[PDB]
RNA sequence: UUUCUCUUUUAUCUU
RNA sequence: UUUCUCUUUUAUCUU
RNA sequence: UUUCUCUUUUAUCUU
RNA sequence: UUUCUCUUUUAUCUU
């Protein structure tokens, strides 16, 4: 309506990459409409993955603002949550290496910093009505990457400081604000900027595990562990400003839970002049006051998650909220 | 008609008999003569849960603060024995209120009193694999004490906490709801006293019978083990009857579901607690609500299938208006 | 005139520049673009305090969550030295939010952002015994890091938290309020950044410089010791300038008083926390309030005598209406 | 609407020629109105370029340092075997002491407003040879995490500059022209807002002392030298300007280099600089969107000839966008 | 609103994005500047098809006249290899237009140009036996040539038809539709050029790479074999992106269905052909439809479930009217 | 995401 | 390339 | 513990 | 198999 005409082309595209379904959004948009207009590279990451769930085991999936990695998972005994004895393994978006090299010290070779725009996820059951069982629970945690300070009895004695994931503890309880339906109904949900503005984040070098090498989980406070594995295949290149989507998928004993898992990521990077990437860059979109306030509203308005069913009805549900709040203004 | 109830008095009746998924501030409080400062804690649990075949799983919704329910499974067609031990499943943030040591429960709050205690089981299995039933009855479980002597030097007499009325779980009460598993169930408990008196927070309790106490001395039929003092524990016993749920899963039956639990509790906050910030005066006496509460409770069925969880609030309002009608004559 | 501000936008301006002894829900939140779930924590300290004669007592109102202020006394006519260490005085319920171990701060909440930071000193001594003065200035104390090498095997390079700008406490800033002790004082701090960005909760910090770190390596002029990890600690550093208060008590002077401290802080709650129950969406952007906030702040005096603590809200409203007047022309 | 006095000054310090007696202005017009001290750093460096060499000058958001210079054989770029040495702005010590732990003694934090650079050839017309090439790099100061086998075993975390690998090649978006023609270029805030960065203590080298260049990922090294003459006091949010003066064999390339820098620092009450401090200018939406627009519009760099016709390029853009938006 | 389109211009948009099961004369033609004599050929295929378990069957909707689709199956979880060959499934009456010898295609018609290319998959299996998924993306497959030398006497240089962009089938494109098998799917392709230029009929083509040509010389990743020149063949390559459909059938899964394909094609008839009798002038330029066509195409999702095949025409009309609205402002 | 009344029942802005 | 009525007789757009 | 308007701004009860 | 308008848009019958 008179709302969809106030937005700039960029402003609109932005809002779609953010809440629109993967199929509808054929155009990632020139990026984020805000004060920043420097050279960037918009990359819409998309993972499609046929996954089958282990029976008699609850599998936890974490979607975090980590570049080049779609999600992190780990399976635990049914009815339980992660423990110190738990470790999450990352699943890379296509071409993670082509972006962040193959050695924990060559992440900032292609790009120096970044900032997330959208970060969606969906689960589409593919089991027949004679085999499905279990539930899909979803909530979001405000996990941020900080640091911890502690002394070390070396010679001479020294004080350490390393990266720690703060608020990870939230994954050990299903917060009151959550989605939770039968497995068969699938689920669809997005995440948004947990900051007043879209500030860029630095690319992080050498990060492979958290707690890192030579550090006890005890000294970090983190409830469980994060392992990206062989530096040559994956790794932790940074941590964005998006709350982390948590997903508990309960699979009963003798239940066949097969589904497709999808993941979106509209990320804006700062290309290095040397990168064979740079030639695809352009300038960040101009500020679009409207789109920005719409984003915030839509975001806070939308439900935790929705069933897979209404994934398409999503874009519409959104376009509704916009005209509704832009009408009362 | 429902305009004879104070704002809170009404809210109260809702927190009580209806699952207020609706995000009201969680309850106002109890419309009783007491109007001192309290904190209305709205506890809510969402637990995905798969039931093992050939087992009759027992769940207890007890008035133990911080713990949503306790369970244990016994072979099909059987009930708990001395050889049985129930393990508690805490509501989110248990430690955030009761600490991590059996002697730091009274740190945050000093006493409490329950207002509502609801529970629902929503099947998540398919229609070809499920089988079995859900049976429900309620037990007048109170928390007393046992007095016995010990041959020490010098010989002395002991006294410890013992749960009376537990023997009620060893059989399916006559007043009960029993129906096919797939149909789920919703049920709630109520104040088993003429008034809403406050109970003290109990320090040191982690197991019943207590460690170093031989079972049967107490006379309890089975055991209650909350586990690590740093993860869970028994902080008190409310004046609510305990809800018993027997879910018998036959052989080769894939019965999964989602369990939800609600608990409106008025706690007396301690000034040194941050939690105290959210304290308000308890609602003023609302003679009408207190008389309705009683009437509604006595009316409602032991439990109902999951489906009628919605029609719940409505079913209540009609019982009220129907009661307020007879009051005019 | 003051009707151009959203309900919260106004509330915000009050929590900010006025001591809201009034029992509003403690603040609404910040009227910034951010609208994610937060918990408005209204911290308030009431500390009776007697000042030792012949000593110039220094108090620091720092943006360290959970700690109202830090103090230490130096001989009259002098300032802190390397030989000085400041001990924190926590707001009530510090542990109730940050635990009892330097690695359990991020348990309850993950990040935060201050909104208000006020402090008042109300003399309680008689008019025949008091003597001395209260001087006040504000320091742009930020929390950076220091990089230095260590002769270990193998030799390595360290990096630890160091407080920059502390040197500002060693002298009475030119922009300052200074007046007789008996006249008391009220003053508040404000966001030392163009926006309200969130800061991470910091794990492990108990002292600065950190244990095992020689003072001066950091370059700090004195030390910060929070003490037992089980009683206090340093959980983060807000983007507020620190308030410095020098209360010089001459020889034989009986100077006693009551100190009050207020702090509106928006924290990002963790779903597993009970505290999360009281979370709400941050207030929507209120362009006007954000522009007023800035204007009011720049206007107000460094500080004012205790007496004008009341006329505070009024003094503010007039500054606003006076600013909104010039906006019409 | 129109610009404020400060909002206009802000746009001049930003892209305005320094021969215009440019006013530092009151600073940056944004939401922030806190006490700050405006410093207009200017360096004039007479310099001769080694023939058969390709000298690399880097303009980085390092306070008190005008630029970092290193040289490599003609036709090549910096390598692991390279180290850049900083040339300080006047009175570096008067601001950040003489110890690697005396930086935060005068000011606690800062934020850049402008960062320009100019090269004015002084060579005659037959003696000179070579070319000047410019491109900008999004170099940011991050951190690296690696383990160390000490007793007991530990994990080490330190500063590491990311995006330096961009200096090892000539960015597609670049200015390239004959040496003699000189050059002028400027950088802008690489962030949506002008946030404050803290002052950094103890930084003298990167990789730091006791760290191999291999542990950092950094393609080469950064050395400020004697903690009593220079050092790294912080890293601002401005893209780093890269200038490659390619001098061939037998080429006499002499020239002057100027470096501008409008910085807003948060003064320490105890510092002498505090008396000079005022409040940051009130937010000026117009200027903040002009700055952003002018920046994106301007070319990477221009020959030193158009250093005066610079201000007029800007005034033009200012009203050419204040025109496509003034109609409706 | 939809009255700004010429009769044909509208018809055109329907033949294009909607399955016109409705028996209109099959399309009017293309509302482009061209108005010479053409014959609107409405190709439609109805193919019953059962998918083998443990195989990931691949289907290609290519702009090859007379052939509805090409398929081949690869082991589950895998894609085509050099060892793969796709076999074409012709629309009815292939020979009735292109003869029975690779050198009699240009007999009936000389050139052509596609207008629509739609495809739908409607599951026919029960809800207890099906399993698996349907994934869809589109490839910019064009038909180029490869130049290489041959050691003959005298030695010479060759040149033959090679399909470029086929490598796109070896992976699931990011812009894709993926959902449970049972949900079916509908999708259509569009002109991958700025205009509707005519393509020549190609004589002699039966296989790619051509007989006597070693695979890989061409650089194609797999092979295309139309078979007997008297039953099928490759008569040309339209300027439409090719539609890729991966139907993964897990082990023991009974996945059957019905596939439908539509193709509006404008051919230039030859006077000696009887077919020429049904030729008419191409529709006159309809600037509006040509601009809508483009807009509608860009909007629609990669694909949609079979169910929304009906709501298709409607979904389109709304996109149009919505576009024509913004054109007034 | 839909429609108002009614009393709610808090909550500030103003005399 | 010319002029309208008439019923044609299909054909969509709209309720 | 005092006086109303005003818009607040949430919040249920009712069609 | 249902209801008309509207312009369609072809198509003959008639001057
Ligand atoms: Ca922790
Ligand atoms: Ca009593
Ligand atoms: Ca007994
Ligand atoms: Ca910011
Ligand atoms: Ca110092
Ligand atoms: Ca590198
Ligand atoms: Ca053409
Ligand atoms: Ca190839
Ligand atoms: Cl796959």
* C-alpha–C-alpha distance, residues B218 and D245, integer Å: 91
Which one-letter DSSP state was computed for residue C315? H
Please choose, from the candidates B108, B55, B95, B70, the residue with its C-alpha nearest in 3D space to the C-alpha of residue B252. B55
β-pair partners for E247: E57, E134
Q: Is B18 exposed, middle or buried (0-12, 13-18, 19+ CB in 10 A)?
A: buried
Contact A114, A68 (CB under 8 A): no
Q: Residue B274 and residue C96: Cβ atoms within 8 Å? A: yes
CA angle C169, C43, D110 (to 5 degrees): 40
Contact D63, D236 (CB under 8 A): yes
Give the Cβ contact number of residue B154 at 10 Å. 5
Give the Cβ contact number of residue A136 at 10 Å. 28
Q: Is D305 exposed, middle or buried (0-12, 13-18, 19+ CB in 10 A)?
A: exposed
Give the Cβ contact number of residue B119 at 10 Å. 24
Which helix (DSSP H) or strand (DSSP E) does residue E114 occupy?
strand E109-114
* C-alpha–C-alpha distance, residues A51 and D67, integer Å: 54
Query: Which site among D101, D108, D203 would you substitute to test the C interface, given the most C Cβ atoms closer than 10 Å to its Cβ?
Result: D108
The two structure tokens encoding residue C90: 């926590």
The two structure tokens encoding residue C272: 């597993």
CA angle D52, D55, D59 (to 5 degrees): 170
**Residues with Cβ < 8 Å from D191, sequence gap 6 or more?**
A36, A199, A200, D237
Residues belonging to the binding site of D for Ca(2+) are 105, 165, 193, 195, 217
In words, the CATH class of domain D1-328 is mainly beta
Give the Cβ contact number of residue D172 at 10 Å. 12
Report how this structure was experimentally obtained. Answer: X-ray
Peptide bond into C209 cis (omega under 30): yes
Contact C164, D199 (CB under 8 A): yes
Q: Residue B273 and residue C93: Cβ atoms within 8 Å? A: yes
Closest CA–CA distance from residue D133 to any residue of chain A (Å): 13
Phi, psi of D146 (to 5 degrees): -140, 150
CA distances in angstroms from D267 to A289, C54, C114, D110, listed in the order given: 34, 31, 22, 9
β-pair partners for A191: A119
CB-closest option in B47, B127, B256 to A134: B256
* C-alpha–C-alpha distance, residues C228 and C230, integer Å: 5
Torsion-angle region of C133 (φ positive above 0: left; ψ -120 to 50: alpha; else: beta):
beta
Q: For B26, which residue in chain C has the nearest alpha carbon?
A: C277
* C-alpha–C-alpha distance, residues D121 and B241, integer Å: 93
Contact C169, C244 (CB under 8 A): yes
* C-alpha–C-alpha distance, residues B134 and B156, integer Å: 46
The two structure tokens encoding residue C97: 């939010």
Ligand nearest to the Cα of C162, by number: 5
Contact of chains E and D by CB distance (3 or more pairs under 8 angstroms):
no
Contact A314, A186 (CB under 8 A): no
* Positions of E strands within E127-286: 133-139, 142-150, 156-164, 177-180, 185-189, 199-200, 207-208, 223-225, 242-249, 255-269, 280-281
* C-alpha–C-alpha distance, residues B141 and A259, integer Å: 45
Please choose, from the candidates B102, C161, D166, the residue with its C-alpha nearest in 3D space to the C-alpha of residue A203. D166
Please choose, from the candidates C187, C137, C190, the residue with its C-alpha nearest in 3D space to the C-alpha of residue C308. C187
Resolution in A: 3.2
Torsion-angle region of E152 (φ positive above 0: left; ψ -120 to 50: alpha; else: beta):
beta
Name the one residue in this structure whose structure tokens are 């009274």. Answer: B106
Torsional sign, CA A167, A170, A176, A181: positive
* C-alpha–C-alpha distance, residues D75 and D53, integer Å: 8
Half-sphere exposure of C267 (CA within 13 A, CB side): 31
**Residues with Cβ < 8 Å from D212, sequence gap 6 or more?**
none
**Residues with Cβ < 8 Å from E59, sequence gap 6 or more?**
E69, E70, E71, E244, E245, E246, E247, E259
Q: For D136, which residue in chain A has the nearest alpha carbon?
A: A273
**Beta-sheet pairing, B133-139 with C37-51:** unpaired
Give the Cβ contact number of residue B247 at 10 Å. 24
Q: Residue A56 and residue B50: Cβ atoms within 8 Å? A: yes
Which one-letter DSSP state was computed for residue D109? E
Half-sphere exposure of A313 (CA within 13 A, CB side): 8
Classify B120 as helix, strand or coil: strand
Residue B203, annotated as binding a ligand: no
The two structure tokens encoding residue E221: 């990743």
Torsional sign, CA E265, E266, E270, E273: positive
The two structure tokens encoding residue C114: 């201050």
How many Å from the CA of B1 to C1' of H14? 10
Residue B48 Cβ under 7 A from any strand H atom = no
The two structure tokens encoding residue D316: 């033009």
**Residues with Cβ < 8 Å from C237, sequence gap 6 or more?**
C62, C63, C64, C142, C143, C199, C202
Contact E233, E208 (CB under 8 A): no
Chain D hits for C63, CB-CB cut-off 8 Å, are none
* C-alpha–C-alpha distance, residues D161 and D217, integer Å: 8
Residue A243 annotated to the active site: no
Which helix (DSSP H) or strand (DSSP E) does residue E10 occupy?
helix E7-17
* C-alpha–C-alpha distance, residues D101 and B279, integer Å: 48
Which one-letter DSSP state was computed for residue A54? P
The two structure tokens encoding residue D93: 């010590």
**Residues with Cβ < 8 Å from C230, sequence gap 6 or more?**
C95, C100, C101
* C-alpha–C-alpha distance, residues A219 and C289, integer Å: 42
β-pair partners for A268: A42, A115
Please choose, from the candidates E279, E312, E257, the residue with its C-alpha nearest in 3D space to the C-alpha of residue E132. E257
Q: Is A153 exposed, middle or buried (0-12, 13-18, 19+ CB in 10 A)?
A: exposed
The two structure tokens encoding residue E225: 């074999």
Contact E304, E177 (CB under 8 A): yes
Contact D216, A205 (CB under 8 A): yes
- Interface A-D, measured as beta-carbon pairs within 8 A, has a size of 154
**Residues with Cβ < 8 Å from E70, sequence gap 6 or more?**
E59, E60, E62, E64, E86, E87, E88, E89, E224
Please choose, from the candidates A77, A136, A170, the residue with its C-alpha nearest in 3D space to the C-alpha of residue B46. A136
Name the one residue in this structure whose structure tokens are 């009609």. Answer: B318
**Residues with Cβ < 8 Å from C327, sequence gap 6 or more?**
none
How many Å from the CA of A120 to C1' of F2? 29
Which of residues 280 to 319 on C have a Cβ less than 7 angstroms from any strand H atom? Answer: none
Find how far residue B129's CA is from the centre of its chain. 30
* C-alpha–C-alpha distance, residues D104 and D95, integer Å: 9
CA angle A318, A322, A327 (to 5 degrees): 150
* E7: nt with nearest C1' to CA: I9
How many Å from the CA of A323 to C1' of F2? 14
* C-alpha–C-alpha distance, residues C150 and D162, integer Å: 24
Length of chain D equals 328
Which one-letter DSSP state was computed for residue D166? G
CA distances in angstroms from A275 to A101, E24, E274, listed in the order given: 12, 55, 60
**Beta-sheet pairing, A57-63 with A209-210:** unpaired
Give the Cβ contact number of residue D295 at 10 Å. 18
Contact E187, E136 (CB under 8 A): yes
Phi, psi of B140 (to 5 degrees): -75, 50
DSSP H helices, chain C, are 7-17, 95-98, 287-299, 311-326
Give the Cβ contact number of residue D209 at 10 Å. 18
β-pair partners for D133: D176, D244
Please choose, from the candidates B174, B175, B166, the residue with its C-alpha nearest in 3D space to the C-alpha of residue B143. B166
* C-alpha–C-alpha distance, residues E96 and E90, integer Å: 12
**Residues with Cβ < 8 Å from C211, sequence gap 6 or more?**
A151, A159
Give the Cβ contact number of residue A106 at 10 Å. 17
* C-alpha–C-alpha distance, residues D227 and E154, integer Å: 77
Classify B154 as helix, strand or coil: coil
B1-329 topology per CATH: Jelly Rolls (2.60.120)
DSSP string of C246-292, one letter each residue = EEEE-TT--EEEEEEEEEEEEEEE-TTSSGGGG-EEPPPP-HHHHHH
* C-alpha–C-alpha distance, residues E303 and E311, integer Å: 13
* C-alpha–C-alpha distance, residues D135 and D173, integer Å: 6
* C-alpha–C-alpha distance, residues E204 and E102, integer Å: 4
Ligand nearest to the Cα of B170, by number: 3
Chain B hits for C278, CB-CB cut-off 8 Å, are 278
Please choose, from the candidates D45, D43, D46, D51, the residue with its C-alpha nearest in 3D space to the C-alpha of residue D253. D51
Closest CA–CA distance from residue A197 to any residue of chain C (Å): 7
Q: What share of chain B is helix, strand, coil (3-state, %, to 5)?
A: 20, 35, 45
Please choose, from the candidates B62, E57, B73, A206, the residue with its C-alpha nearest in 3D space to the C-alpha of residue D156. A206
Torsional sign, CA B123, B124, B126, B130: negative
* C-alpha–C-alpha distance, residues C149 and E179, integer Å: 57
* C-alpha–C-alpha distance, residues D123 and D132, integer Å: 14
Of D19, D23, D173, D223, which residue is the catalytic one? D19
**Residues with Cβ < 8 Å from B61, sequence gap 6 or more?**
B68, B69, B117, B119, B189, B242, B243, B244, B245, B261
* C-alpha–C-alpha distance, residues A63 and A65, integer Å: 7
For chain A, the structural domain boundaries read 1-329
* C-alpha–C-alpha distance, residues A32 and A200, integer Å: 12
Q: For C216, which residue in chain D has the nearest alpha carbon?
A: D101
Classify E42 as helix, strand or coil: strand
Q: Residue E175 and residue A46: Cβ atoms within 8 Å? A: yes
Peptide bond into A220 cis (omega under 30): no
**Residues with Cβ < 8 Å from B83, sequence gap 6 or more?**
B222
Query: Which site among D29, D158, D162, D208 would you substitute to test the A interface, given the most A Cβ atoms closer than 10 Å to its Cβ?
Result: D162
Classify B308 as helix, strand or coil: helix
* C-alpha–C-alpha distance, residues B132 and B180, integer Å: 6
Residue A325 Cβ under 7 A from any strand F atom = yes
* C-alpha–C-alpha distance, residues A71 and A88, integer Å: 9
Please choose, from the candidates D228, D193, D245, D285, the residue with its C-alpha nearest in 3D space to the C-alpha of residue D4. D285
Classify D317 as helix, strand or coil: helix
DSSP string of A238-269, one letter each residue = ---SBPEEEEEEEE-TT--EEEEEEEEEEEEE
Give the Cβ contact number of residue E52 at 10 Å. 11
Contact D240, D186 (CB under 8 A): no
Which one-letter DSSP state was computed for residue C105? S
Torsional sign, CA D119, D121, D127, D129: positive
List of long-range contacts for E296-301, beta carbons under 8 Å, 24+ apart: E296/E13, E296/E17, E296/E320, E296/E323, E297/E17, E297/E190, E298/A26, E298/A27, E299/A24, E300/E17, E300/E188, E301/A21, E301/A23, E301/A24, E301/A312, E301/E177
* C-alpha–C-alpha distance, residues C159 and B261, integer Å: 48
Contact B80, B169 (CB under 8 A): yes
Contact C253, C3 (CB under 8 A): no
Which one-letter DSSP state was computed for residue A98? H
Contact A167, C109 (CB under 8 A): yes
The two structure tokens encoding residue C306: 């205790």
Torsion of CA A266, A272, A273, A278, to 10 degrees: -20
Contact D159, D203 (CB under 8 A): yes
**Beta-sheet pairing, C242-249 with C55-61:** antiparallel
DSSP string of B208-265, one letter each residue = ESPTT--TTTS--SSEEE---TTT-------SBPEEEEEEEE-TT--EEEEEEEEEEE
Peptide bond into C172 cis (omega under 30): no
Phi, psi of E82 (to 5 degrees): -60, -30
Contact C161, A149 (CB under 8 A): yes
DSSP string of E45-81, one letter each residue = EEEEEEEPTTEEEEEEE---TTEEEEEEEEETT----
């Amino acid at each position: 309506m008179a709302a969809l005409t106030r937005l700039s082309q960029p402003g609109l595209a932005f809002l779609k990459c953010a809440f629109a379904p993967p199929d509808f959004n054929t155009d990632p948009g020139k990026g984020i409409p805000d004060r920043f207009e420097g050279k960037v590279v918009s990359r819409k990451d998309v993972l499609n993955q046929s996954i089958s769930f282990t029976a008699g085991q609850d599998t936890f999936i974490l979607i975090a603002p980590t570049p080049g990695v779609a999600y992190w998972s780990a399976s635990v005994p049914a009815g339980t949550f992660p423990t110190s004895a738990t470790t999450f393994n990352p699943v890379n978006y296509p071409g993670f290496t082509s972006m962040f090299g193959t050695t924990s010290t060559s992440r900032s070779d292609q790009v120096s910093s970044f900032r997330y725009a959208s970060m969606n996820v969906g689960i589409y059951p593919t089991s027949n009505l004679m085999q499905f069982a279990g539930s899909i629970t979803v909530w979001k945690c405000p996990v941020k990457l900080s640091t911890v300070q502690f002394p070390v009895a070396t010679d001479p004695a020294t004080s350490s400081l390393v990266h720690t994931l703060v608020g990870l503890d939230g994954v050990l309880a299903v917060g009151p604000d959550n989605f939770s339906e039968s497995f068969i109904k699938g689920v669809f949900s997005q995440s948004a900027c947990n900051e007043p503005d879209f500030e860029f984040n630095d690319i992080l070098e050498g990060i492979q595990t958290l707690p890192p090498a030579n550090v006890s989980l005890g000294s970090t406070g983190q409830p469980f562990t994060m392992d990206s594995g062989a530096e040559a295949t994956s790794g932790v290149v940074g941590w964005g400003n998006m709350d982390t989507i948590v997903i508990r998928v309960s699979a009963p004993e003798g239940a066949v839970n097969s589904a497709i898992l999808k993941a979106w990521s509209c990320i804006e990077y700062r290309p290095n002049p040397n990168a064979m990437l740079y030639q695809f860059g352009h300038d960040s979109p101009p500020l679009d006051e409207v789109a920005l306030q719409e984003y915030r509203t839509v975001a806070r308005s939308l439900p935790v998650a929705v069933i897979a069913a209404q994934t398409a009805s999503m874009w519409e549900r959104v376009k509704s909220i916009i005209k509704s709040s832009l009408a009362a203004a």
